Amino acid sequence: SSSVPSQKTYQGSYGFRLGFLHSGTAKSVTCTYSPALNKMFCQLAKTCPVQLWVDSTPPPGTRVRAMAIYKQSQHMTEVVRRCPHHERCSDSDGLAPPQHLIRVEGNLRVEYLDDRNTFRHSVVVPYEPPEVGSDCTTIHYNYMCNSSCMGGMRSPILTIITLEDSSGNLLGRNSFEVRVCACPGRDRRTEEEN
C-alpha cells in the first residue's frame, strides 16, 4: 500500500519536543543543527545526537521511532533507502538492515522495522527518562548514505521522530530536514546565507 507519512508536528499530552546541541559551524564539527532552517547537517556514519524533551514523563514501555521520508515532490510515496554502493558494502553493525538509511548507535535494544504494509523503514528505541539531574534524553543516530547517494535528492530528506506507547499509539511527532555531507559546518553556513 502507498503511504505519505504525516509531517505534522504534535507535542501531544507529554509536551514532546526535540532539542539539538548548539555546536556552531567550525571545520571540526561533525554534526550541526540550523534552527533557522530546522535542518541537521551531519557526516555519513558519524554520531548525530538528538535530544528528546518532555513536559511530563511518558509511561514505562514508551518507544521512540525515526523514519526518513522525501519531504515533497513525486518522491513523497517513495520509500527512502540506501543506494547500491552503500547497501551492498562492508558496513553492517550486526543490528541494522543493510538498506536502512538510519541507524541508532550504542543501544542494544534498538529495533528495525520494514513495515509489512507500507514497506517504510524505521528504527525504534525504548524511551528512557533522563537520568536524575539531566533535562533530556539523547539518541545517537547515524545516517548511512550521503545526500548525493539519494535518487529523489528534487527533494530534501526529512527525519520524522515519533513518540509511541508500548501498543503503537502515537503520543507525539516532530521532524527536521537532514543533509549528509562532507562539511556540515560549511554547508550550514552557506545554506543560511541563502
Ligand SMILES: [Zn+2]
Ligand atoms: Zn549511498
